[PDB]
């Protein structure tokens, strides 16, 4: 069931395994638990334009595909 979402930060590339039927907030919660961070945003591109919204109910799978990389901005 689960897919892989890669999170690029200044600490490296963190692999998050998550159900595509989960919501974006769960992704945010997953990242928080995996990383030592404060207020962060997740973005679709390295230049931080399109922010992923801390949900619930925008599903992971509607905006993201297996192996996609998102970009963390503090």
Partner 1 sequence: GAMEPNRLIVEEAQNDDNSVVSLSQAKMDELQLFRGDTVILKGKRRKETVCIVLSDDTCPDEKIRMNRVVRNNLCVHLSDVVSVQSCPDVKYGKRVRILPIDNLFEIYLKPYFLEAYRPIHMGDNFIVRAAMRPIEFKVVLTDPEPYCIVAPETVIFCD
Contact set with partner 1 (CB under 8 A): 4, 6, 10-15, 46, 67, 69
CA distance 38 to 35: 9
Block residue for tokens 């997953």: 30
CA distance 56 to 74: 21
Q: Which is nearer to partner 1, 56 or 67 (CB)?
A: 67
Q: Which is nearer to partner 1, 5 or 24 (CB)?
A: 5
Helix (H/G/I), strand (E/B), else coil: 31: helix
Shortest CB 2 distance to partner 1, Å = 13
CA distance 69 to 57: 20
Q: Which is nearer to partner 1, 50 or 53 (CB)?
A: 50
Shortest CB 56 distance to partner 1, Å = 26
């Amino acid at each position: 069931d689960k897919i892989l979402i890669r999170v690029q930060s200044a600490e490296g590339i963190k692999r998050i395994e998550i159900s595509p039927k989960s919501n974006l907030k769960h992704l945010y919660d997953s990242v928080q638990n995996a990383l030592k961070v404060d207020g962060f945003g997740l973005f679709k591109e390295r230049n931080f334009l399109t922010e992923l919204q801390a949900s619930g109910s925008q599903l992971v799978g509607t905006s993201l595909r297996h192996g996609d990389m998102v970009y963390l901005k503090q």
